[PDB]
Amino acid sequence: DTWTGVEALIRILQQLLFIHFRIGCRHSRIGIIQQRRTRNGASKS
Amino acid sequence: DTWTGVEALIRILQQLLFIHFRIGCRHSRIGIIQQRRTRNGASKS
Numbered sequence A, B: 001d002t003w004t005g006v007e008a009l010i011r012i013l014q015q016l017l018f019i020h021f022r023i024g025c026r027h028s029r030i031g032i033i034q035q036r037r038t039r040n041g042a043s044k045s
Helices: A004-024 B004-024
Strands: none
Touching: A004 B004
């Protein structure tokens, strides 16, 4: 596990960051796609 | 230290490996440069 614990830690850390920035500084709205969730709660009709 | 502890850990781990391979799988003989260290110990003259 000497290097196998580092090489996989070299990517595991880079992999995570790759998500934090692509999901924290520019996450996508997968799901809404032009469709507000009826606001927080505007009753119905 | 959330990311600052990861981004620097993403490189610190890649940086180290960069050395292990360039100093463990192909280290340089900086110092000898065509000059065996008089063998392990062949006395003198």
